[PDB]
Protein backbone atom coordinates (compact mmCIF):
# COMPACT_ATOMS: atom_id res chain seq x y z
CA UNK A 1 0.00 0.00 0.00
CA UNK A 2 2.85 2.39 -0.80
CA UNK A 3 0.39 4.45 -2.84
CA UNK A 4 -2.04 4.38 0.09
CA UNK A 5 0.96 5.10 2.34
CA UNK A 6 1.67 8.29 0.39
CA UNK A 7 -2.05 9.10 0.19
CA UNK A 8 -2.41 9.02 3.98
CA UNK A 9 0.77 11.08 4.29
CA UNK A 10 -0.81 13.52 1.83
CA UNK A 11 -4.04 13.81 3.83
CA UNK A 12 -2.12 14.40 7.07
CA UNK A 13 -0.02 17.12 5.42
CA UNK A 14 -3.23 18.59 4.01
CA UNK A 15 -5.05 19.02 7.33
CA UNK A 16 -2.02 19.71 9.56
CA UNK A 17 -0.52 22.23 7.13
CA UNK A 18 -2.47 24.73 4.96
CA UNK A 19 -6.14 23.80 5.46
CA UNK A 20 -9.13 24.16 3.14
CA UNK A 21 -12.43 23.20 4.80
CA UNK A 22 -13.45 21.25 7.90
CA UNK A 23 -9.81 21.14 9.06
CA UNK A 24 -10.66 24.30 11.01
CA UNK A 25 -12.71 21.98 13.24
CA UNK A 26 -9.60 20.05 14.30
CA UNK A 27 -7.75 23.33 14.84
CA UNK A 28 -10.80 24.59 16.73
CA UNK A 29 -10.71 21.62 19.10
CA UNK A 30 -7.01 22.08 19.86
CA UNK A 31 -7.74 25.81 20.21
CA UNK A 32 -10.43 25.15 22.83
CA UNK A 33 -8.12 22.65 24.56
CA UNK A 34 -5.20 25.06 24.97
CA UNK A 35 -7.63 27.90 25.79
CA UNK A 36 -9.26 25.92 28.60
CA UNK A 37 -5.75 25.17 29.87
CA UNK A 38 -5.15 28.93 29.93
CA UNK A 39 -8.43 29.60 31.76
CA UNK A 40 -7.74 26.88 34.34
CA UNK A 41 -4.25 28.26 34.97
CA UNK A 42 -5.91 31.63 35.56
CA UNK A 43 -8.28 29.99 38.05
CA UNK A 44 -5.22 28.47 39.74
CA UNK A 45 -3.91 31.76 41.12
CA UNK A 46 -7.18 32.38 42.98
CA UNK A 47 -6.62 31.26 46.56
CA UNK A 48 -9.85 29.37 47.25
CA UNK A 49 -10.42 27.48 43.98
CA UNK A 50 -6.73 26.48 43.86
CA UNK A 51 -7.46 22.86 44.82
CA UNK A 52 -9.90 21.97 42.03
CA UNK A 53 -7.81 24.13 39.69
CA UNK A 54 -4.60 22.12 40.09
CA UNK A 55 -6.62 18.89 40.30
CA UNK A 56 -7.73 19.41 36.70
CA UNK A 57 -4.63 21.32 35.60
CA UNK A 58 -2.14 18.46 35.97
CA UNK A 59 -4.33 16.03 34.01
CA UNK A 60 -5.36 18.41 31.23
CA UNK A 61 -1.78 19.68 30.84
CA UNK A 62 -0.67 16.08 30.27
CA UNK A 63 -3.45 15.74 27.68
CA UNK A 64 -2.45 18.86 25.77
CA UNK A 65 1.27 18.08 25.80
CA UNK A 66 0.53 14.59 24.46
CA UNK A 67 -1.59 16.18 21.72
CA UNK A 68 1.13 18.72 20.90
CA UNK A 69 3.73 15.95 20.86
CA UNK A 70 1.91 13.70 18.42
CA UNK A 71 0.95 16.73 16.30
CA UNK A 72 4.59 17.80 16.00
CA UNK A 73 5.88 14.29 15.28
CA UNK A 74 3.23 13.43 12.68
CA UNK A 75 3.81 16.85 11.10
CA UNK A 76 7.45 15.83 10.63
CA UNK A 77 6.19 12.49 9.30
CA UNK A 78 3.70 14.16 6.92
CA UNK A 79 6.28 16.61 5.54
CA UNK A 80 7.02 13.97 2.88
CA UNK A 81 4.40 15.37 0.50
CA UNK A 82 6.70 18.39 0.26
CA UNK A 83 9.80 17.53 -1.76
CA UNK A 84 12.09 19.99 0.05
CA UNK A 85 11.64 17.79 3.14
CA UNK A 86 12.37 14.21 2.05
CA UNK A 87 14.60 11.88 4.03
CA UNK A 88 17.19 12.69 6.68
CA UNK A 89 18.52 16.02 5.41
CA UNK A 90 15.18 17.31 4.13
CA UNK A 91 13.21 16.49 7.27
CA UNK A 92 16.07 17.87 9.37
CA UNK A 93 15.98 21.19 7.54
CA UNK A 94 12.24 21.08 8.24
CA UNK A 95 13.33 20.68 11.86
CA UNK A 96 15.58 23.71 11.27
CA UNK A 97 12.48 25.77 10.46
CA UNK A 98 12.28 28.36 13.27
CA UNK A 99 8.61 27.74 14.11
CA UNK A 100 9.19 24.01 14.62
CA UNK A 101 12.19 24.80 16.85
CA UNK A 102 9.95 26.94 19.06
CA UNK A 103 7.44 24.08 19.12
CA UNK A 104 9.91 21.37 20.16
CA UNK A 105 11.30 23.94 22.62
CA UNK A 106 8.04 24.40 24.53
CA UNK A 107 7.40 20.63 24.42
CA UNK A 108 10.68 19.70 26.10
CA UNK A 109 10.33 22.76 28.34
CA UNK A 110 6.92 21.79 29.75
CA UNK A 111 8.14 18.21 30.24
CA UNK A 112 11.07 19.68 32.17
CA UNK A 113 8.61 21.67 34.30
CA UNK A 114 7.10 18.29 35.17
CA UNK A 115 10.61 16.82 35.53
CA UNK A 116 7.88 28.74 42.00
CA UNK A 117 7.90 27.78 38.31
CA UNK A 118 4.15 28.44 37.97
CA UNK A 119 4.73 31.95 36.60
CA UNK A 120 6.86 30.25 33.95
CA UNK A 121 3.86 28.00 33.26
CA UNK A 122 1.52 30.89 32.49
CA UNK A 123 4.25 32.57 30.42
CA UNK A 124 4.66 29.36 28.40
CA UNK A 125 0.89 29.22 27.92
CA UNK A 126 0.85 32.73 26.45
CA UNK A 127 3.71 31.65 24.18
CA UNK A 128 1.92 28.51 22.97
CA UNK A 129 -1.19 30.67 22.55
CA UNK A 130 0.59 33.00 20.12
CA UNK A 131 1.90 29.79 18.50
CA UNK A 132 -1.60 29.06 17.14
CA UNK A 133 -1.17 31.65 14.36
CA UNK A 134 1.72 29.88 12.53
CA UNK A 135 1.60 32.50 9.75
CA UNK A 136 1.90 36.08 11.00
CA UNK A 137 -0.84 37.01 8.54
CA UNK A 138 -2.73 38.90 11.25
CA UNK A 139 0.02 41.46 11.89
CA UNK A 140 0.64 41.59 8.13
CA UNK A 141 -2.95 42.52 7.28
CA UNK A 142 -3.08 44.98 10.18
CA UNK A 143 0.16 46.69 9.17
CA UNK A 144 -0.95 46.82 5.54
CA UNK A 145 -4.18 48.68 6.28
CA UNK A 146 -2.57 50.87 8.96
CA UNK A 147 0.30 51.96 6.70
CA UNK A 148 -2.30 52.65 4.00
CA UNK A 149 -4.43 54.85 6.28
CA UNK A 150 -1.47 56.22 8.26
CA UNK A 151 -2.05 59.93 7.63
CA UNK A 152 -5.74 59.92 8.57
CA UNK A 153 -5.10 57.95 11.77
CA UNK A 154 -2.33 60.39 12.70
CA UNK A 155 -4.71 63.28 11.98
CA UNK A 156 -7.43 61.84 14.22
CA UNK A 157 -5.08 61.10 17.12
CA UNK A 158 -3.25 64.43 16.81
CA UNK A 159 -6.33 66.65 16.79
CA UNK A 160 -7.93 64.50 19.50
CA UNK A 161 -4.77 64.88 21.57
CA UNK A 162 -4.96 68.67 21.30
CA UNK A 163 -8.65 68.56 22.22
CA UNK A 164 -7.73 66.45 25.25
CA UNK A 165 -5.11 68.94 26.44
CA UNK A 166 -7.31 72.00 25.88
CA UNK A 167 -10.49 70.60 27.45
CA UNK A 168 -8.66 69.11 30.44
CA UNK A 169 -6.69 72.30 31.06
CA UNK A 170 -9.78 74.52 30.98
CA UNK A 171 -11.65 72.13 33.30
CA UNK A 172 -8.69 72.10 35.71
CA UNK A 173 -8.71 75.91 35.84
CA UNK A 174 -12.48 76.04 36.37
CA UNK A 175 -12.47 73.26 38.99
CA UNK A 176 -9.44 73.72 41.22
CA UNK A 177 -11.19 75.32 44.19
CA UNK A 178 -14.44 73.58 45.11
CA UNK A 179 -13.43 70.01 44.19
CA UNK A 180 -10.98 67.54 45.71
CA UNK A 181 -11.06 65.39 42.56
CA UNK A 182 -8.97 67.74 40.40
CA UNK A 183 -6.02 68.51 42.69
CA UNK A 184 -3.25 68.68 40.07
CA UNK A 185 -3.02 68.85 36.29
CA UNK A 186 -2.16 65.13 36.18
CA UNK A 187 -5.47 64.04 37.73
CA UNK A 188 -7.20 66.41 35.30
CA UNK A 189 -5.41 64.69 32.41
CA UNK A 190 -6.56 61.33 33.80
CA UNK A 191 -10.14 62.62 33.76
CA UNK A 192 -9.80 63.86 30.18
CA UNK A 193 -8.38 60.57 28.93
CA UNK A 194 -11.07 58.55 30.72
CA UNK A 195 -13.99 60.56 29.35
CA UNK A 196 -12.91 61.27 25.77
CA UNK A 197 -12.46 57.50 25.29
CA UNK A 198 -16.04 57.04 26.59
CA UNK A 199 -14.86 54.75 29.39
CA UNK A 200 -16.40 56.80 32.19
CA UNK A 201 -15.22 55.34 35.48
CA UNK A 202 -17.01 57.87 37.69
CA UNK A 203 -14.23 58.60 40.17
CA UNK A 204 -13.74 62.17 38.89
CA UNK A 205 -16.74 64.04 37.49
CA UNK A 206 -17.07 67.84 37.32
CA UNK A 207 -19.01 69.21 40.29
CA UNK A 208 -19.37 72.89 39.37
CA UNK A 209 -21.10 75.04 36.76
CA UNK A 210 -18.01 76.27 34.90
CA UNK A 211 -16.58 72.76 34.70
CA UNK A 212 -19.78 71.03 33.63
CA UNK A 213 -20.47 73.76 31.07
CA UNK A 214 -17.01 73.45 29.53
CA UNK A 215 -17.14 69.64 29.51
CA UNK A 216 -20.63 69.75 27.96
CA UNK A 217 -19.16 71.57 24.96
CA UNK A 218 -15.89 69.67 24.56
CA UNK A 219 -17.42 66.21 25.04
CA UNK A 220 -19.17 66.17 21.65
CA UNK A 221 -15.78 66.87 20.08
CA UNK A 222 -13.60 64.65 22.26
CA UNK A 223 -15.65 61.47 22.04
CA UNK A 224 -15.97 62.00 18.28
CA UNK A 225 -12.23 62.41 17.70
CA UNK A 226 -11.09 59.55 19.95
CA UNK A 227 -13.46 57.05 18.28
CA UNK A 228 -12.43 57.86 14.69
CA UNK A 229 -9.56 55.34 14.18
CA UNK A 230 -11.86 52.44 15.10
CA UNK A 231 -14.37 53.42 12.42
CA UNK A 232 -11.62 54.30 9.94
CA UNK A 233 -9.83 50.95 10.23
CA UNK A 234 -13.21 49.20 10.22
CA UNK A 235 -14.29 50.70 6.91
CA UNK A 236 -10.73 50.12 5.72
CA UNK A 237 -10.93 46.36 6.21
CA UNK A 238 -14.40 46.39 4.65
CA UNK A 239 -13.34 48.16 1.45
CA UNK A 240 -10.13 46.11 1.21
CA UNK A 241 -11.88 42.73 1.42
CA UNK A 242 -14.54 44.02 -0.97
CA UNK A 243 -12.02 44.84 -3.69
CA UNK A 244 -10.13 41.63 -2.92
CA UNK A 245 -13.40 39.80 -3.59
CA UNK A 246 -13.84 41.62 -6.91
CA UNK A 247 -10.24 40.94 -7.95
CA UNK A 248 -10.58 37.32 -6.79
CA UNK A 249 -13.35 36.74 -9.34
CA UNK A 250 -11.47 38.41 -12.23
CA UNK A 251 -8.19 36.47 -12.39
CA UNK A 252 -8.19 36.09 -16.22
CA UNK A 253 -4.48 35.14 -16.06
CA UNK A 254 -5.10 31.54 -17.16
CA UNK A 255 -3.61 32.18 -20.62
CA UNK A 256 -0.13 33.26 -19.38
CA UNK A 257 -0.35 30.55 -16.70
CA UNK A 258 -0.77 27.76 -19.25
CA UNK A 259 1.92 29.45 -21.33
CA UNK A 260 4.16 29.40 -18.25
CA UNK A 261 3.82 25.64 -17.77
CA UNK A 262 4.00 25.13 -21.55
CA UNK A 263 7.38 26.75 -22.10
CA UNK A 264 8.58 25.54 -18.69
CA UNK A 265 8.22 21.96 -19.92
CA UNK A 266 9.73 23.11 -23.21
CA UNK A 267 12.81 24.22 -21.27
CA UNK A 268 13.02 21.12 -19.08
CA UNK A 269 12.55 18.80 -22.07
CA UNK A 270 15.23 20.76 -23.93
CA UNK A 271 17.45 20.93 -20.83
CA UNK A 272 20.36 18.48 -20.68
CA UNK A 273 19.29 17.15 -17.25
CA UNK A 274 17.95 13.91 -18.78
CA UNK A 275 18.91 11.85 -21.83
CA UNK A 276 15.61 9.99 -22.30
CA UNK A 277 13.97 13.25 -23.44
CA UNK A 278 13.09 12.86 -27.12
CA UNK A 279 9.32 13.45 -27.44
CA UNK A 280 9.50 17.26 -27.40
CA UNK A 281 12.94 17.06 -29.03
CA UNK A 282 11.29 15.11 -31.85
CA UNK A 283 8.37 17.57 -31.80
CA UNK A 284 10.84 20.25 -32.87
CA UNK A 285 12.86 18.12 -35.28
CA UNK A 286 9.53 17.40 -37.03
CA UNK A 287 8.13 20.96 -37.16
CA UNK A 288 11.25 22.12 -39.05
CA UNK A 289 24.43 22.51 -32.58
CA UNK A 290 20.70 22.24 -33.20
CA UNK A 291 20.20 21.08 -29.60
CA UNK A 292 21.47 24.34 -28.09
CA UNK A 293 19.86 26.32 -30.92
CA UNK A 294 16.35 25.18 -30.03
CA UNK A 295 17.43 25.29 -26.37
CA UNK A 296 18.47 28.96 -26.42
CA UNK A 297 15.40 30.10 -28.36
CA UNK A 298 13.26 28.05 -25.97
CA UNK A 299 14.87 29.66 -22.92
CA UNK A 300 14.09 33.06 -24.45
CA UNK A 301 10.52 31.86 -25.03
CA UNK A 302 10.29 30.75 -21.40
CA UNK A 303 11.63 34.09 -20.16
CA UNK A 304 9.10 36.09 -22.20
CA UNK A 305 6.50 33.63 -20.91
CA UNK A 306 7.57 34.25 -17.31
CA UNK A 307 7.52 38.03 -17.76
CA UNK A 308 4.18 38.01 -19.60
CA UNK A 309 2.81 35.91 -16.73
CA UNK A 310 4.21 38.48 -14.29
CA UNK A 311 2.48 41.29 -16.21
CA UNK A 312 -0.93 39.59 -16.42
CA UNK A 313 -0.52 38.50 -12.78
CA UNK A 314 -2.01 41.86 -11.68
CA UNK A 315 -5.36 42.53 -13.35
CA UNK A 316 -7.57 44.77 -11.22
CA UNK A 317 -11.26 45.69 -11.30
CA UNK A 318 -10.94 49.36 -12.24
CA UNK A 319 -7.60 48.82 -14.01
CA UNK A 320 -9.36 46.26 -16.22
CA UNK A 321 -11.90 48.69 -17.67
CA UNK A 322 -9.44 51.61 -17.65
CA UNK A 323 -6.50 49.91 -19.38
CA UNK A 324 -8.69 47.82 -21.70
CA UNK A 325 -10.68 50.89 -22.78
CA UNK A 326 -7.53 52.90 -23.44
CA UNK A 327 -6.27 49.89 -25.39
CA UNK A 328 -9.66 49.27 -27.00
CA UNK A 329 -10.07 52.82 -28.24
CA UNK A 330 -6.46 53.09 -29.45
CA UNK A 331 -6.90 49.86 -31.39
CA UNK A 332 -10.11 51.49 -32.62
CA UNK A 333 -8.02 54.46 -33.81
CA UNK A 334 -5.87 52.04 -35.80
CA UNK A 335 -9.14 50.59 -37.11
CA UNK A 336 -10.61 53.88 -38.33
CA UNK A 337 -7.33 54.98 -39.91
CA UNK A 338 -6.97 51.59 -41.62
CA UNK A 339 -10.59 51.99 -42.72
CA UNK A 340 -10.05 55.38 -44.35
CA UNK A 341 -6.70 54.36 -45.88
CA UNK A 342 -7.98 51.09 -47.36
CA UNK A 343 -11.22 52.61 -48.66
CA UNK A 344 -9.03 55.32 -50.19
CA UNK A 345 -7.10 52.49 -51.83
CA UNK A 346 -10.52 51.51 -53.19
CA UNK A 347 -10.86 55.15 -54.29
CA UNK A 348 -7.29 55.06 -55.61
CA UNK A 349 -8.29 52.46 -58.20
Amino acid sequence: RNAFYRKLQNFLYNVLERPRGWAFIYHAYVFLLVFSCLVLSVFSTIKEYEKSSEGALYILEIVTIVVFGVEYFVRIWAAGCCCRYRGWRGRLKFARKPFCVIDIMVLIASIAVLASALRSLRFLQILRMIRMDRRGGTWKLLGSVVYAHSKELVTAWYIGFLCLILASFLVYLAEKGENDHFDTYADALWWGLITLTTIGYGDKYPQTWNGRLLAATFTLIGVSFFALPAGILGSGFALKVQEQHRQKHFEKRRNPAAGLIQSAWRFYATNLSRTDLHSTWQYYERTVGLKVSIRAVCVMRFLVSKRKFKESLRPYDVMDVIEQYSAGHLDMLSRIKSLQSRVDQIVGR
Binding site: N14, C83, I261, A264, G289, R295, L303, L313
Partner: protein, 143 residues
Protein backbone atom coordinates in the same frame (compact mmCIF):
# COMPACT_ATOMS: atom_id res chain seq x y z
CA UNK B 1 33.45 23.78 -18.35
CA UNK B 2 35.14 25.11 -21.49
CA UNK B 3 33.31 22.51 -23.59
CA UNK B 4 29.91 24.07 -22.89
CA UNK B 5 31.48 27.54 -23.15
CA UNK B 6 32.68 26.85 -26.70
CA UNK B 7 29.36 25.08 -27.30
CA UNK B 8 27.49 28.29 -26.49
CA UNK B 9 30.13 30.06 -28.60
CA UNK B 10 29.04 27.95 -31.57
CA UNK B 11 25.44 28.77 -30.63
CA UNK B 12 26.53 32.42 -30.63
CA UNK B 13 28.01 32.14 -34.13
CA UNK B 14 24.90 30.27 -35.28
CA UNK B 15 22.68 33.01 -33.88
CA UNK B 16 25.14 35.45 -35.48
CA UNK B 17 24.59 36.10 -39.19
CA UNK B 18 26.49 39.30 -40.02
CA UNK B 19 29.23 38.97 -37.40
CA UNK B 20 29.15 42.04 -35.15
CA UNK B 21 30.09 40.31 -31.89
CA UNK B 22 26.43 40.35 -30.80
CA UNK B 23 23.04 38.89 -31.74
CA UNK B 24 20.57 41.35 -33.23
CA UNK B 25 16.79 40.97 -33.11
CA UNK B 26 16.66 40.15 -36.82
CA UNK B 27 18.91 37.13 -36.28
CA UNK B 28 16.39 35.95 -33.68
CA UNK B 29 13.60 36.43 -36.20
CA UNK B 30 15.33 34.47 -38.95
CA UNK B 31 16.34 31.60 -36.65
CA UNK B 32 12.80 31.27 -35.30
CA UNK B 33 11.75 31.24 -38.95
CA UNK B 34 14.52 28.68 -39.51
CA UNK B 35 12.48 26.32 -37.30
CA UNK B 36 9.18 27.16 -39.04
CA UNK B 37 7.52 29.64 -36.67
CA UNK B 38 7.10 33.24 -37.87
CA UNK B 39 7.27 35.57 -34.84
CA UNK B 40 6.43 39.24 -34.54
CA UNK B 41 8.82 42.15 -34.07
CA UNK B 42 7.66 42.91 -30.53
CA UNK B 43 8.14 39.24 -29.61
CA UNK B 44 11.86 39.29 -30.44
CA UNK B 45 12.18 42.66 -28.70
CA UNK B 46 10.69 41.15 -25.53
CA UNK B 47 13.25 38.35 -25.84
CA UNK B 48 15.93 41.06 -25.88
CA UNK B 49 14.51 42.45 -22.64
CA UNK B 50 14.88 38.93 -21.24
CA UNK B 51 18.51 38.47 -22.29
CA UNK B 52 20.31 41.82 -22.53
CA UNK B 53 21.31 43.80 -19.44
CA UNK B 54 23.02 46.97 -20.69
CA UNK B 55 20.22 48.02 -23.06
CA UNK B 56 21.77 48.09 -26.53
CA UNK B 57 19.17 46.46 -28.81
CA UNK B 58 21.02 43.17 -29.41
CA UNK B 59 22.23 40.06 -27.55
CA UNK B 60 25.94 39.87 -26.80
CA UNK B 61 27.84 36.74 -25.79
CA UNK B 62 28.00 37.49 -22.02
CA UNK B 63 24.23 37.92 -21.67
CA UNK B 64 23.57 34.85 -23.83
CA UNK B 65 25.95 32.84 -21.64
CA UNK B 66 24.23 34.04 -18.47
CA UNK B 67 20.82 33.11 -19.88
CA UNK B 68 22.10 29.61 -20.68
CA UNK B 69 24.03 29.22 -17.41
CA UNK B 70 21.17 29.33 -14.88
CA UNK B 71 18.82 26.45 -14.07
CA UNK B 72 15.28 26.38 -12.65
CA UNK B 73 16.88 26.36 -9.18
CA UNK B 74 18.46 29.71 -10.18
CA UNK B 75 15.18 31.38 -11.23
CA UNK B 76 13.09 32.07 -8.08
CA UNK B 77 10.07 30.73 -9.95
CA UNK B 78 8.54 28.65 -7.14
CA UNK B 79 5.71 31.02 -6.23
CA UNK B 80 5.35 32.00 -9.91
CA UNK B 81 4.70 28.46 -11.13
CA UNK B 82 2.57 27.65 -8.08
CA UNK B 83 0.33 30.62 -8.88
CA UNK B 84 0.16 29.52 -12.52
CA UNK B 85 -0.95 26.08 -11.32
CA UNK B 86 -3.40 27.75 -8.91
CA UNK B 87 -5.20 29.51 -11.78
CA UNK B 88 -5.79 26.00 -13.14
CA UNK B 89 -6.37 24.71 -9.61
CA UNK B 90 -10.09 25.34 -9.97
CA UNK B 91 -11.33 23.78 -6.72
CA UNK B 92 -8.16 24.97 -4.99
CA UNK B 93 -7.17 21.69 -3.35
CA UNK B 94 -4.03 21.02 -5.39
CA UNK B 95 -5.16 18.43 -7.91
CA UNK B 96 -6.21 18.27 -11.57
CA UNK B 97 -7.23 15.27 -13.66
CA UNK B 98 -4.70 14.15 -16.27
CA UNK B 99 -7.27 14.44 -19.07
CA UNK B 100 -7.93 18.05 -18.04
CA UNK B 101 -4.19 18.70 -18.19
CA UNK B 102 -4.14 17.33 -21.74
CA UNK B 103 -7.23 19.31 -22.80
CA UNK B 104 -6.03 22.66 -21.43
CA UNK B 105 -2.30 22.31 -22.15
CA UNK B 106 -2.80 21.07 -25.72
CA UNK B 107 -5.49 23.65 -26.61
CA UNK B 108 -4.39 26.83 -24.79
CA UNK B 109 -1.84 29.21 -26.29
CA UNK B 110 1.49 27.54 -27.09
CA UNK B 111 -0.03 24.08 -27.25
CA UNK B 112 1.84 20.78 -27.58
CA UNK B 113 1.05 17.22 -28.69
CA UNK B 114 -0.10 14.19 -26.69
CA UNK B 115 3.24 12.47 -26.02
CA UNK B 116 4.66 15.71 -24.60
CA UNK B 117 1.74 16.41 -22.26
CA UNK B 118 1.77 12.77 -21.18
CA UNK B 119 5.46 13.24 -20.40
CA UNK B 120 4.39 16.21 -18.26
CA UNK B 121 1.97 13.91 -16.42
CA UNK B 122 4.54 11.14 -15.91
CA UNK B 123 6.98 13.74 -14.55
CA UNK B 124 4.45 15.71 -12.45
CA UNK B 125 2.17 12.95 -11.14
CA UNK B 126 4.94 10.96 -9.47
CA UNK B 127 3.05 7.92 -8.20
CA UNK B 128 0.99 7.94 -11.40
CA UNK B 129 -2.71 8.33 -10.55
CA UNK B 130 -3.55 11.13 -13.00
CA UNK B 131 -4.44 13.34 -10.02
CA UNK B 132 -1.39 15.60 -9.88
CA UNK B 133 -0.26 17.33 -6.69
CA UNK B 134 1.35 20.28 -8.49
CA UNK B 135 3.40 21.20 -5.41
CA UNK B 136 5.36 17.94 -5.60
CA UNK B 137 6.22 18.73 -9.22
CA UNK B 138 7.28 22.32 -8.57
CA UNK B 139 9.25 21.37 -5.45
CA UNK B 140 10.93 18.62 -7.49
CA UNK B 141 12.01 20.48 -10.63
CA UNK B 142 11.62 24.23 -10.04
CA UNK B 143 13.64 24.10 -6.80
Amino acid sequence: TEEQIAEFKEAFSLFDKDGDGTITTKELGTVMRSLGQNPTEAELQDMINEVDADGNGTIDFPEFLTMMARKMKDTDSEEEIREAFRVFDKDGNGYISAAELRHVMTNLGEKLTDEEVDEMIREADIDGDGQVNYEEFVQMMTA
